[PDB]
Write a protein that binds this ligand. Structure first.
Ligand SMILES: *C(=O)C[C@@H]1O[C@@H](C)[C@@H](O)[C@@H](O)[C@@H]1O
Ligand SMILES: [Ca+2]
Ligand SMILES: [Ca+2]
Length: 114
Protein backbone atom coordinates (compact mmCIF):
# COMPACT_ATOMS: atom_id res chain seq x y z
CA UNK A 1 0.00 0.00 0.00
CA UNK A 2 1.01 3.59 -0.44
CA UNK A 3 2.76 4.99 2.63
CA UNK A 4 3.88 8.44 3.63
CA UNK A 5 0.89 10.28 2.07
CA UNK A 6 -1.50 12.14 4.38
CA UNK A 7 -4.51 14.38 3.80
CA UNK A 8 -4.44 17.36 6.14
CA UNK A 9 -7.14 20.01 6.52
CA UNK A 10 -6.62 22.67 3.89
CA UNK A 11 -4.76 25.89 4.57
CA UNK A 12 -3.46 24.73 7.96
CA UNK A 13 0.02 25.05 9.47
CA UNK A 14 1.69 21.85 10.53
CA UNK A 15 5.08 20.84 11.90
CA UNK A 16 7.42 18.33 10.26
CA UNK A 17 10.49 16.94 12.02
CA UNK A 18 12.93 14.23 10.91
CA UNK A 19 15.31 12.06 12.95
CA UNK A 20 18.12 9.81 11.65
CA UNK A 21 19.35 6.39 12.88
CA UNK A 22 21.57 4.87 10.20
CA UNK A 23 25.07 4.85 8.79
CA UNK A 24 23.67 6.44 5.61
CA UNK A 25 22.90 10.09 4.99
CA UNK A 26 19.12 10.34 4.87
CA UNK A 27 17.33 12.79 2.60
CA UNK A 28 13.71 13.50 3.53
CA UNK A 29 11.59 15.40 1.01
CA UNK A 30 8.22 16.83 2.05
CA UNK A 31 5.83 17.54 -0.86
CA UNK A 32 2.76 19.75 -0.38
CA UNK A 33 0.27 19.44 -3.24
CA UNK A 34 3.00 17.59 -5.18
CA UNK A 35 5.57 20.41 -4.88
CA UNK A 36 8.65 20.37 -2.66
CA UNK A 37 8.07 22.39 0.51
CA UNK A 38 11.03 21.19 2.62
CA UNK A 39 14.03 18.91 2.18
CA UNK A 40 16.10 17.74 5.10
CA UNK A 41 19.38 15.83 5.03
CA UNK A 42 21.72 14.46 7.65
CA UNK A 43 23.43 11.42 9.15
CA UNK A 44 23.17 10.09 12.70
CA UNK A 45 22.95 6.78 14.53
CA UNK A 46 21.75 8.66 17.61
CA UNK A 47 18.35 10.04 16.62
CA UNK A 48 19.64 13.50 15.75
CA UNK A 49 17.11 15.89 14.35
CA UNK A 50 18.10 16.47 10.75
CA UNK A 51 15.41 19.09 10.22
CA UNK A 52 12.28 20.68 11.69
CA UNK A 53 10.00 23.19 10.00
CA UNK A 54 6.53 24.71 10.01
CA UNK A 55 4.72 24.47 6.68
CA UNK A 56 1.26 25.26 5.31
CA UNK A 57 -0.88 22.43 3.92
CA UNK A 58 -2.24 24.67 1.12
CA UNK A 59 -5.47 24.34 -0.83
CA UNK A 60 -5.25 20.54 -1.31
CA UNK A 61 -4.06 19.44 2.12
CA UNK A 62 -2.02 16.69 0.45
CA UNK A 63 1.32 16.05 2.17
CA UNK A 64 3.77 13.39 1.03
CA UNK A 65 7.01 12.29 2.70
CA UNK A 66 9.73 10.71 0.52
CA UNK A 67 13.00 9.30 1.92
CA UNK A 68 16.10 8.52 -0.15
CA UNK A 69 19.54 7.16 0.84
CA UNK A 70 22.43 6.71 -1.55
CA UNK A 71 20.03 7.95 -4.28
CA UNK A 72 17.60 5.03 -3.66
CA UNK A 73 14.11 5.27 -2.14
CA UNK A 74 13.79 3.72 1.30
CA UNK A 75 10.91 1.37 2.13
CA UNK A 76 8.32 3.36 4.12
CA UNK A 77 5.89 2.53 6.94
CA UNK A 78 3.38 5.07 8.19
CA UNK A 79 0.16 5.77 10.05
CA UNK A 80 -1.82 8.65 11.49
CA UNK A 81 -3.07 8.88 15.07
CA UNK A 82 -5.53 11.37 16.54
CA UNK A 83 -5.86 12.09 20.25
CA UNK A 84 -8.99 13.62 21.85
CA UNK A 85 -10.42 14.21 18.39
CA UNK A 86 -8.09 17.22 18.02
CA UNK A 87 -4.35 16.51 18.11
CA UNK A 88 -3.02 14.82 14.97
CA UNK A 89 0.18 12.93 14.30
CA UNK A 90 1.34 11.54 10.95
CA UNK A 91 4.23 9.12 11.55
CA UNK A 92 6.74 7.69 9.07
CA UNK A 93 9.50 5.14 9.49
CA UNK A 94 11.86 4.02 6.77
CA UNK A 95 14.31 1.23 5.99
CA UNK A 96 17.42 1.76 3.87
CA UNK A 97 19.00 -1.65 4.34
CA UNK A 98 18.30 -5.21 5.46
CA UNK A 99 17.99 -5.15 9.26
CA UNK A 100 14.34 -3.99 9.16
CA UNK A 101 14.53 -1.64 12.11
CA UNK A 102 12.59 0.99 10.09
CA UNK A 103 14.13 3.85 12.09
CA UNK A 104 16.72 4.91 9.54
CA UNK A 105 14.78 8.11 8.96
CA UNK A 106 11.83 8.75 11.28
CA UNK A 107 9.47 11.59 10.39
CA UNK A 108 6.81 13.13 12.64
CA UNK A 109 4.18 15.54 11.32
CA UNK A 110 1.91 17.24 13.87
CA UNK A 111 -1.03 19.62 13.68
CA UNK A 112 -2.63 21.93 14.56
CA UNK A 113 -0.05 24.38 15.81
CA UNK A 114 -0.35 27.61 17.77
C1 LIG B 1 24.42 -0.37 7.62
O1 LIG B 1 24.83 0.54 6.95
C2 LIG B 1 22.88 -0.32 7.78
C3 LIG B 1 22.34 0.94 8.35
O2 LIG B 1 23.13 1.56 9.36
C4 LIG B 1 23.17 0.77 10.55
C5 LIG B 1 24.15 1.48 11.49
C6 LIG B 1 21.78 0.59 11.23
O3 LIG B 1 21.20 1.87 11.62
C7 LIG B 1 20.88 0.05 10.10
O4 LIG B 1 19.51 0.07 10.65
C8 LIG B 1 20.90 0.96 8.90
O5 LIG B 1 20.01 0.34 7.92
CA1 LIG C 1 17.71 -0.12 8.97
CA1 LIG D 1 18.72 2.03 11.85
Amino acid sequence: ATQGVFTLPANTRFGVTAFANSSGTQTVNVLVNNETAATFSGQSTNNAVIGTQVLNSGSSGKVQVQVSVNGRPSDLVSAQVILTNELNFALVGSEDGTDNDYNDAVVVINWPLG
